[PDB]
Amino acid sequence: MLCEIECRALSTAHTRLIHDFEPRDALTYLEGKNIFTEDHSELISKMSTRLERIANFLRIYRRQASELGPLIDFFNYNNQSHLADFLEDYIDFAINEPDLLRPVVIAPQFSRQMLDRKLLLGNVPKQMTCYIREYHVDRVIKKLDEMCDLDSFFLFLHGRAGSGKSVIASQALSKSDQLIGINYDSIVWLKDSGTAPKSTFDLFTDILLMLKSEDDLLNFPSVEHVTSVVLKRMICNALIDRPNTLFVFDDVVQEETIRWAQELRLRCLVTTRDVEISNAASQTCEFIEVTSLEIDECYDFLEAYGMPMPVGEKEEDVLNKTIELSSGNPATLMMFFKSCEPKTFEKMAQLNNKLESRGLVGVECITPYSYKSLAMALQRCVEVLSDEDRSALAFAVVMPPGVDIPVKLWSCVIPVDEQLDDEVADRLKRLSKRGALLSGKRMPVLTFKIDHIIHMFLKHVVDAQTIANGISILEQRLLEIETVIRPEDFPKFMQLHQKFYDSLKNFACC
């Protein structure tokens, strides 16, 4: 058998094996060095077109030869020496001088038009343009660049919903000319979204077919009914003809995916919302998180899509309202612009109202996002949730948004099955780990925080009763014996945040 290196040389050099070559010239020179069989030579000598004899010659060869010898010792004798010279250069700048391989024998054939092709065929989606998140697309390219040597690996690009990850993998695979061509030969990008136990199998059905040739896409059997071991063996089989193939697994929800990708010793970029799926993998796991757009970057994104910038103070404030509201979130920011109709800052604060008094549903719109509003999205993050975690989440409504508050102050509204309530913190950690719904912050004292998008999600989504029950179940424990968290000498009075409590109550008599 060959391997990933000798087949990457045989793959990199395919425009050439198509421009000048013929399998009949080599069939004779090769029955001799013992790398074929008379059905092999039967299958390759009688073929109407040449690309057929060629695509079968590179497949039968990638399986049959004990080595990559009798094809250097052939492009040489047939006066197509201009070939065997290219392939021996790749094996010498591979075995002997490594590293030198990416700059010297692989890169000098890049072409910003082959890119669009490799991308289109690998189902990489059409990268975003009016704004690119520098840090991320970049630090991503670096960490993908760092691993092409590796035999198998996971890159987990995890964040909030609508937080902008998928877009970053699109731009990050659309930026370089290196990642595709230099670091990895092909791309297969598949969107998951699997919940059923069958989704994770159907997925790898479409990997297996994403790898597959145009011929033998005609020949598709009832593989829907074919074993797990066989779709798997069929893949690591049909995967020989695919040396270094990068895999984007857009939106993994099931920890079952991650186990399959890892039994198949595959290379994975993974966009996901829930991070714990990574516990499935025993490996070089690397993680890269897409955070909420910082107060300044948000500015950059608005300017980017022709939006007029403030002057008066209560206009930069209208925008700190949006920035406060969409607690730094690409998708909802986008619905925000998309719904700003006349373009005025006026109609923007208008939305800023509509948003407080009707939740995310005040701004749901047709957007490049696959979801009308962030609520359809978080829906799932909330369904998948351990039943108890589902409860904790349902209660953090009656909190203050964009406010840092200690764990015992949470032990009051939050459920549990004694005197140490640490269990609350464990649930809020699972809760931030699993959709990035909260916000954990270790010292000065263990305190969490709920952002605003993640709140007005819960406002108009939890049971109208559980709002008033949390306000009261809190007001019970509530009496006992700026950049500053509220002290233990002064907790007895949450009245400080009375504002975001008077509003909630005016909403729980509605």
């Binding site: 829906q379 909330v382 369904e383 589902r390 409860s391 349902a394 108009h460 989504v461 939890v462 049971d463 009763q465 559980t466």
Partner: peptide, 5 residues
């Protein structure tokens, strides 16, 4: 308790 989910 979750308005559907």
């Amino acid at each position: 308790m979750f308005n559907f989910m």
